[PDB]
mmCIF file of C-alpha atoms and ligand atoms in Angstrom:
data_model
loop_
_atom_site.group_PDB
_atom_site.id
_atom_site.type_symbol
_atom_site.label_atom_id
_atom_site.label_comp_id
_atom_site.label_asym_id
_atom_site.label_seq_id
_atom_site.Cartn_x
_atom_site.Cartn_y
_atom_site.Cartn_z
ATOM 1 C CA UNK A 1 50.948 31.243 -4.597
ATOM 2 C CA UNK A 2 53.765 33.071 -6.345
ATOM 3 C CA UNK A 3 54.301 36.746 -5.602
ATOM 4 C CA UNK A 4 53.965 38.829 -8.762
ATOM 5 C CA UNK A 5 56.603 41.312 -9.967
ATOM 6 C CA UNK A 6 54.864 44.761 -10.030
ATOM 7 C CA UNK A 7 57.713 47.074 -11.038
ATOM 8 C CA UNK A 8 61.225 48.249 -10.432
ATOM 9 C CA UNK A 9 63.213 51.458 -10.002
ATOM 10 C CA UNK A 10 66.896 51.897 -10.938
ATOM 11 C CA UNK A 11 68.892 54.941 -9.775
ATOM 12 C CA UNK A 12 72.298 55.825 -11.289
ATOM 13 C CA UNK A 13 72.417 59.369 -9.902
ATOM 14 C CA UNK A 14 74.628 59.775 -6.781
ATOM 15 C CA UNK A 15 74.299 62.416 -4.083
ATOM 16 C CA UNK A 16 76.453 63.166 -1.060
ATOM 17 C CA UNK A 17 75.430 62.787 2.550
ATOM 18 C CA UNK A 18 78.095 64.883 4.213
ATOM 19 C CA UNK A 19 81.545 64.533 2.694
ATOM 20 C CA UNK A 20 81.852 60.808 3.577
ATOM 21 C CA UNK A 21 78.755 59.049 2.118
ATOM 22 C CA UNK A 22 78.442 59.041 -1.707
ATOM 23 C CA UNK A 23 75.088 57.289 -2.014
ATOM 24 C CA UNK A 24 72.459 56.223 -4.520
ATOM 25 C CA UNK A 25 69.019 56.554 -2.994
ATOM 26 C CA UNK A 26 67.275 53.336 -4.084
ATOM 27 C CA UNK A 27 63.931 54.139 -2.467
ATOM 28 C CA UNK A 28 62.257 56.744 -0.332
ATOM 29 C CA UNK A 29 58.882 57.037 1.473
ATOM 30 C CA UNK A 30 58.616 60.484 -0.106
ATOM 31 C CA UNK A 31 58.190 58.875 -3.562
ATOM 32 C CA UNK A 32 56.598 55.419 -2.862
ATOM 33 C CA UNK A 33 55.006 55.976 0.601
ATOM 34 C CA UNK A 34 52.839 53.189 2.077
ATOM 35 C CA UNK A 35 53.857 50.738 -0.693
ATOM 36 C CA UNK A 36 57.228 50.334 1.062
ATOM 37 C CA UNK A 37 55.815 49.994 4.649
ATOM 38 C CA UNK A 38 57.468 49.346 6.997
ATOM 39 C CA UNK A 39 60.570 50.443 5.082
ATOM 40 C CA UNK A 40 61.178 54.205 4.683
ATOM 41 C CA UNK A 41 64.470 54.730 2.850
ATOM 42 C CA UNK A 42 67.475 52.903 1.386
ATOM 43 C CA UNK A 43 70.727 54.675 0.555
ATOM 44 C CA UNK A 44 73.511 52.634 -1.023
ATOM 45 C CA UNK A 45 77.106 53.832 -0.901
ATOM 46 C CA UNK A 46 78.480 51.836 -3.825
ATOM 47 C CA UNK A 47 82.275 51.144 -3.636
ATOM 48 C CA UNK A 48 84.071 54.496 -3.540
ATOM 49 C CA UNK A 49 87.772 55.081 -3.000
ATOM 50 C CA UNK A 50 88.850 57.320 -0.132
ATOM 51 C CA UNK A 51 92.566 57.980 0.092
ATOM 52 C CA UNK A 52 94.170 58.366 3.572
ATOM 53 C CA UNK A 53 93.134 61.442 5.570
ATOM 54 C CA UNK A 54 93.539 63.196 8.896
ATOM 55 C CA UNK A 55 90.068 64.641 8.496
ATOM 56 C CA UNK A 56 86.816 63.205 9.762
ATOM 57 C CA UNK A 57 84.773 62.499 6.611
ATOM 58 C CA UNK A 58 81.099 61.763 7.047
ATOM 59 C CA UNK A 59 78.218 63.723 8.446
ATOM 60 C CA UNK A 60 78.070 65.961 11.479
ATOM 61 C CA UNK A 61 75.562 66.185 14.308
ATOM 62 C CA UNK A 62 71.982 65.609 13.141
ATOM 63 C CA UNK A 63 68.770 64.447 14.766
ATOM 64 C CA UNK A 64 66.368 61.548 14.215
ATOM 65 C CA UNK A 65 62.988 60.814 15.736
ATOM 66 C CA UNK A 66 60.300 58.193 15.141
ATOM 67 C CA UNK A 67 62.067 55.376 13.319
ATOM 68 C CA UNK A 68 65.136 53.155 13.140
ATOM 69 C CA UNK A 69 68.327 53.412 11.048
ATOM 70 C CA UNK A 70 70.158 50.275 10.043
ATOM 71 C CA UNK A 71 73.761 50.673 8.913
ATOM 72 C CA UNK A 72 75.365 47.695 7.173
ATOM 73 C CA UNK A 73 79.134 47.985 6.491
ATOM 74 C CA UNK A 74 80.398 46.063 3.399
ATOM 75 C CA UNK A 75 83.819 47.704 2.851
ATOM 76 C CA UNK A 76 85.457 50.136 5.234
ATOM 77 C CA UNK A 77 84.124 51.121 8.674
ATOM 78 C CA UNK A 78 81.763 53.685 10.243
ATOM 79 C CA UNK A 79 82.105 55.223 13.702
ATOM 80 C CA UNK A 80 79.027 56.894 15.218
ATOM 81 C CA UNK A 81 78.675 58.960 18.375
ATOM 82 C CA UNK A 82 75.602 60.569 19.991
ATOM 83 C CA UNK A 83 75.117 63.432 22.437
ATOM 84 C CA UNK A 84 74.283 60.947 25.249
ATOM 85 C CA UNK A 85 77.967 59.838 24.879
ATOM 86 C CA UNK A 86 77.018 56.487 23.255
ATOM 87 C CA UNK A 87 77.879 55.144 19.835
ATOM 88 C CA UNK A 88 80.430 52.683 18.534
ATOM 89 C CA UNK A 89 82.292 51.394 15.507
ATOM 90 C CA UNK A 90 80.698 49.335 12.742
ATOM 91 C CA UNK A 91 83.436 47.162 11.201
ATOM 92 C CA UNK A 92 83.188 45.389 7.835
ATOM 93 C CA UNK A 93 80.419 42.780 8.150
ATOM 94 C CA UNK A 94 78.919 44.393 11.284
ATOM 95 C CA UNK A 95 75.489 45.974 11.569
ATOM 96 C CA UNK A 96 74.096 48.785 13.767
ATOM 97 C CA UNK A 97 70.307 48.572 14.215
ATOM 98 C CA UNK A 98 69.620 51.883 15.955
ATOM 99 C CA UNK A 99 66.214 52.823 17.221
ATOM 100 C CA UNK A 100 65.969 56.619 17.238
ATOM 101 C CA UNK A 101 62.572 56.464 18.939
ATOM 102 C CA UNK A 102 61.859 59.577 21.046
ATOM 103 C CA UNK A 103 65.099 61.046 19.729
ATOM 104 C CA UNK A 104 68.814 60.893 19.159
ATOM 105 C CA UNK A 105 71.404 63.452 18.088
ATOM 106 C CA UNK A 106 74.418 61.815 16.450
ATOM 107 C CA UNK A 107 77.275 62.009 14.020
ATOM 108 C CA UNK A 108 78.421 59.280 11.588
ATOM 109 C CA UNK A 109 81.838 59.228 9.982
ATOM 110 C CA UNK A 110 84.542 56.960 8.699
ATOM 111 C CA UNK A 111 86.288 55.130 11.539
ATOM 112 C CA UNK A 112 89.742 56.470 12.505
ATOM 113 C CA UNK A 113 91.284 53.165 11.351
ATOM 114 C CA UNK A 114 89.588 53.368 7.936
ATOM 115 C CA UNK A 115 90.434 57.080 7.604
ATOM 116 C CA UNK A 116 94.121 56.320 8.276
ATOM 117 C CA UNK A 117 94.430 53.455 5.775
ATOM 118 C CA UNK A 118 91.902 54.574 3.104
ATOM 119 C CA UNK A 119 90.524 52.240 0.415
ATOM 120 C CA UNK A 120 87.045 51.368 -0.882
ATOM 121 C CA UNK A 121 84.052 52.299 1.194
ATOM 122 C CA UNK A 122 80.756 50.466 0.669
ATOM 123 C CA UNK A 123 77.672 50.475 2.896
ATOM 124 C CA UNK A 124 73.899 50.486 3.040
ATOM 125 C CA UNK A 125 71.735 52.648 5.305
ATOM 126 C CA UNK A 126 68.131 51.509 5.654
ATOM 127 C CA UNK A 127 65.453 53.410 7.554
ATOM 128 C CA UNK A 128 62.718 51.253 9.116
ATOM 129 C CA UNK A 129 59.490 52.734 10.394
ATOM 130 C CA UNK A 130 58.033 52.083 13.837
ATOM 131 C CA UNK A 131 54.421 51.407 14.748
ATOM 132 C CA UNK A 132 52.771 54.531 16.205
ATOM 133 C CA UNK A 133 52.805 53.120 19.743
ATOM 134 C CA UNK A 134 56.589 52.518 19.579
ATOM 135 C CA UNK A 135 57.710 55.806 18.049
ATOM 136 C CA UNK A 136 58.330 57.608 21.365
ATOM 137 C CA UNK A 137 60.149 54.775 23.130
ATOM 138 C CA UNK A 138 63.649 55.688 24.321
ATOM 139 C CA UNK A 139 66.380 55.521 21.683
ATOM 140 C CA UNK A 140 68.636 52.470 21.853
ATOM 141 C CA UNK A 141 71.405 50.680 19.987
ATOM 142 C CA UNK A 142 71.886 47.161 18.725
ATOM 143 C CA UNK A 143 75.548 46.714 17.811
ATOM 144 C CA UNK A 144 75.782 43.434 15.975
ATOM 145 C CA UNK A 145 79.189 41.899 15.227
ATOM 146 C CA UNK A 146 79.686 40.051 11.925
ATOM 147 C CA UNK A 147 80.284 36.709 13.699
ATOM 148 C CA UNK A 148 76.839 36.835 15.398
ATOM 149 C CA UNK A 149 74.804 37.149 12.189
ATOM 150 C CA UNK A 150 73.420 33.738 11.035
ATOM 151 C CA UNK A 151 74.751 33.026 7.483
ATOM 152 C CA UNK A 152 72.872 30.427 5.467
ATOM 153 C CA UNK A 153 74.446 28.688 2.475
ATOM 154 C CA UNK A 154 71.898 28.704 -0.372
ATOM 155 C CA UNK A 155 73.897 26.363 -2.619
ATOM 156 C CA UNK A 156 77.249 24.604 -2.840
ATOM 157 C CA UNK A 157 78.752 27.312 -5.057
ATOM 158 C CA UNK A 158 79.153 30.241 -2.660
ATOM 159 C CA UNK A 159 75.632 31.777 -2.545
ATOM 160 C CA UNK A 160 74.661 32.840 0.988
ATOM 161 C CA UNK A 161 72.089 34.795 2.922
ATOM 162 C CA UNK A 162 72.585 36.611 6.251
ATOM 163 C CA UNK A 163 69.576 36.938 8.538
ATOM 164 C CA UNK A 164 69.976 40.460 9.849
ATOM 165 C CA UNK A 165 66.380 40.546 11.117
ATOM 166 C CA UNK A 166 63.448 38.152 11.037
ATOM 167 C CA UNK A 167 63.824 34.480 10.272
ATOM 168 C CA UNK A 168 65.056 32.262 7.458
ATOM 169 C CA UNK A 169 65.629 28.430 7.377
ATOM 170 C CA UNK A 170 64.888 28.175 11.132
ATOM 171 C CA UNK A 171 67.684 30.764 11.713
ATOM 172 C CA UNK A 172 66.668 33.786 13.834
ATOM 173 C CA UNK A 173 67.688 37.333 12.954
ATOM 174 C CA UNK A 174 70.457 39.014 14.885
ATOM 175 C CA UNK A 175 68.470 42.261 15.325
ATOM 176 C CA UNK A 176 65.217 42.456 17.314
ATOM 177 C CA UNK A 177 62.325 44.457 15.798
ATOM 178 C CA UNK A 178 59.052 46.185 16.880
ATOM 179 C CA UNK A 179 56.900 44.625 14.121
ATOM 180 C CA UNK A 180 57.161 41.449 11.974
ATOM 181 C CA UNK A 181 59.806 42.012 9.319
ATOM 182 C CA UNK A 182 62.756 40.449 7.525
ATOM 183 C CA UNK A 183 66.028 41.988 6.478
ATOM 184 C CA UNK A 184 68.172 39.519 4.599
ATOM 185 C CA UNK A 185 71.349 40.315 2.647
ATOM 186 C CA UNK A 186 73.795 38.210 0.720
ATOM 187 C CA UNK A 187 75.318 37.057 -2.490
ATOM 188 C CA UNK A 188 73.926 34.867 -5.255
ATOM 189 C CA UNK A 189 76.577 33.297 -7.479
ATOM 190 C CA UNK A 190 76.212 33.392 -11.241
ATOM 191 C CA UNK A 191 74.243 30.446 -12.641
ATOM 192 C CA UNK A 192 72.430 29.541 -9.392
ATOM 193 C CA UNK A 193 68.662 29.662 -8.779
ATOM 194 C CA UNK A 194 66.848 29.992 -5.424
ATOM 195 C CA UNK A 195 63.249 30.004 -4.199
ATOM 196 C CA UNK A 196 62.486 32.210 -1.222
ATOM 197 C CA UNK A 197 59.415 32.018 0.991
ATOM 198 C CA UNK A 198 57.953 35.159 2.540
ATOM 199 C CA UNK A 199 54.978 35.589 4.852
ATOM 200 C CA UNK A 200 51.625 36.018 3.131
ATOM 201 C CA UNK A 201 50.557 39.714 2.995
ATOM 202 C CA UNK A 202 54.068 41.129 3.589
ATOM 203 C CA UNK A 203 55.587 43.985 1.621
ATOM 204 C CA UNK A 204 58.421 42.370 -0.351
ATOM 205 C CA UNK A 205 61.269 44.393 -1.796
ATOM 206 C CA UNK A 206 64.163 42.827 -3.759
ATOM 207 C CA UNK A 207 67.156 45.134 -3.757
ATOM 208 C CA UNK A 208 69.940 44.439 -6.216
ATOM 209 C CA UNK A 209 73.028 46.377 -5.166
ATOM 210 C CA UNK A 210 75.332 44.967 -7.836
ATOM 211 C CA UNK A 211 74.996 42.233 -10.463
ATOM 212 C CA UNK A 212 72.047 40.834 -12.400
ATOM 213 C CA UNK A 213 69.290 38.483 -11.262
ATOM 214 C CA UNK A 214 66.040 37.232 -12.824
ATOM 215 C CA UNK A 215 62.917 37.246 -10.633
ATOM 216 C CA UNK A 216 60.276 34.520 -11.248
ATOM 217 C CA UNK A 217 62.050 33.420 -14.487
ATOM 218 C CA UNK A 218 60.792 36.451 -16.474
ATOM 219 C CA UNK A 219 62.043 39.803 -15.035
ATOM 220 C CA UNK A 220 65.710 40.673 -15.023
ATOM 221 C CA UNK A 221 67.042 43.233 -12.529
ATOM 222 C CA UNK A 222 70.408 45.048 -12.720
ATOM 223 C CA UNK A 223 72.454 46.892 -10.056
ATOM 224 C CA UNK A 224 71.217 49.840 -8.037
ATOM 225 C CA UNK A 225 67.620 48.562 -8.445
ATOM 226 C CA UNK A 226 64.664 47.877 -6.173
ATOM 227 C CA UNK A 227 61.842 45.612 -7.334
ATOM 228 C CA UNK A 228 58.431 45.620 -5.655
ATOM 229 C CA UNK A 229 56.603 42.267 -5.510
ATOM 230 C CA UNK A 230 52.929 41.778 -4.649
ATOM 231 C CA UNK A 231 51.862 41.529 -1.004
ATOM 232 C CA UNK A 232 49.602 38.648 -2.045
ATOM 233 C CA UNK A 233 51.551 35.345 -2.341
ATOM 234 C CA UNK A 234 54.301 33.599 -0.393
ATOM 235 C CA UNK A 235 57.070 32.730 -2.800
ATOM 236 C CA UNK A 236 59.360 34.012 -5.489
ATOM 237 C CA UNK A 237 62.546 32.880 -7.192
ATOM 238 C CA UNK A 238 65.869 34.521 -7.940
ATOM 239 C CA UNK A 239 68.241 33.223 -10.629
ATOM 240 C CA UNK A 240 71.627 34.981 -10.890
ATOM 241 C CA UNK A 241 73.005 35.840 -14.373
ATOM 242 C CA UNK A 242 76.076 37.393 -12.683
ATOM 243 C CA UNK A 243 77.495 37.343 -9.120
ATOM 244 C CA UNK A 244 74.907 39.496 -7.312
ATOM 245 C CA UNK A 245 74.886 41.386 -4.010
ATOM 246 C CA UNK A 246 71.277 41.661 -2.812
ATOM 247 C CA UNK A 247 68.936 42.486 0.013
ATOM 248 C CA UNK A 248 65.490 41.103 0.564
ATOM 249 C CA UNK A 249 63.274 43.295 2.745
ATOM 250 C CA UNK A 250 59.835 42.102 3.852
ATOM 251 C CA UNK A 251 57.407 43.137 6.473
ATOM 252 C CA UNK A 252 53.888 43.422 7.735
ATOM 253 C CA UNK A 253 52.590 46.773 6.442
ATOM 254 C CA UNK A 254 52.025 49.169 9.362
ATOM 255 C CA UNK A 255 48.841 50.617 7.836
ATOM 256 C CA UNK A 256 49.384 53.870 9.731
ATOM 257 C CA UNK A 257 49.831 57.402 8.396
ATOM 258 C CA UNK A 258 53.290 58.634 7.419
ATOM 259 C CA UNK A 259 54.231 62.267 8.029
ATOM 260 C CA UNK A 260 57.910 62.912 7.334
ATOM 261 C CA UNK A 261 60.153 65.933 7.355
ATOM 262 C CA UNK A 262 63.939 65.689 6.955
ATOM 263 C CA UNK A 263 65.184 63.294 9.601
ATOM 264 C CA UNK A 264 61.851 63.034 11.431
ATOM 265 C CA UNK A 265 59.156 60.490 10.522
ATOM 266 C CA UNK A 266 55.989 60.539 12.617
ATOM 267 C CA UNK A 267 52.294 59.797 12.089
ATOM 268 C CA UNK A 268 50.882 63.366 12.095
ATOM 269 C CA UNK A 269 51.802 66.923 11.057
ATOM 270 C CA UNK A 270 51.256 68.009 14.711
ATOM 271 C CA UNK A 271 53.921 65.472 15.797
ATOM 272 C CA UNK A 272 56.279 66.843 13.091
ATOM 273 C CA UNK A 273 55.686 70.385 14.469
ATOM 274 C CA UNK A 274 56.605 69.106 17.977
ATOM 275 C CA UNK A 275 59.788 67.441 16.616
ATOM 276 C CA UNK A 276 60.807 70.644 14.797
ATOM 277 C CA UNK A 277 60.151 72.731 17.936
ATOM 278 C CA UNK A 278 62.025 70.285 20.228
ATOM 279 C CA UNK A 279 65.055 70.253 17.938
ATOM 280 C CA UNK A 280 65.116 73.970 17.133
ATOM 281 C CA UNK A 281 64.862 74.880 20.848
ATOM 282 C CA UNK A 282 67.936 72.698 21.619
ATOM 283 C CA UNK A 283 66.108 69.851 23.466
ATOM 284 C CA UNK A 284 68.109 67.096 21.629
ATOM 285 C CA UNK A 285 71.387 68.371 23.287
ATOM 286 C CA UNK A 286 74.845 68.588 21.615
ATOM 287 C CA UNK A 287 77.929 66.472 20.835
ATOM 288 C CA UNK A 288 81.244 67.495 22.456
HETATM 289 MG MG1 MG B 1 69.678 25.698 -2.098
HETATM 290 MG MG1 MG B 2 84.188 65.320 17.479
HETATM 291 MN MN1 MN B 3 71.902 59.454 11.184
#
């Protein structure tokens, strides 16, 4: 059966994460909760011009525990570094699927190369929740280069879909996951229609970053919008009215409690108290 369109949320109000990430929060667990499971947050840095600088623009040392952060670079580049010495550089087209797990302390900022040359910066940061049993696993990185992400042509006019996680058209996602979920991104060219198939019972979010696309022939979505489709059903259609940059996020709902506070997302208030205590007492370390 067809998934039904339930509603949509458009945000045109930008806020700054540090001095390097001018983002539009498209969804948060704090407002929609379990409806988004397993997804927790989506921040979109729409194209923003940064002139050349000697400074490090971005966000300084901060902690995470209990979930994963996925950084997708569209224009410009992001360098990240943790206290454990690790980190790396996310170039245009690359993805970092970082599992914070038991904990990480890191900084995220424009790469030195991007800082030196300047230009438009565009990225998405998506937070993905972990099942309770997986939340305290050791933190780890998945640095995925643009050339390793399967890219599926949806038509003969330039529409495409990248399988960042999950599976589409027998193509396997580049990032491994702790629960069944899909993260697909791409571009739908004006005047082309596409039917997508999603697993029955999965949360299904259609994120329109830029452009205009009609869902199931009757609901038009503009840029900076997230649409929520019904969990019941396996298919929906997208028909572009303009060249559209999109994400499709689906996943098996975790059906576990969500207790969040700042950059910590756990299952209970007691676990949040432990995270606060661990961080405030300096147990996450420091970045030199
Ligand atoms: Mg096709
Ligand atoms: Mg430094
Ligand atoms: Mn972070």
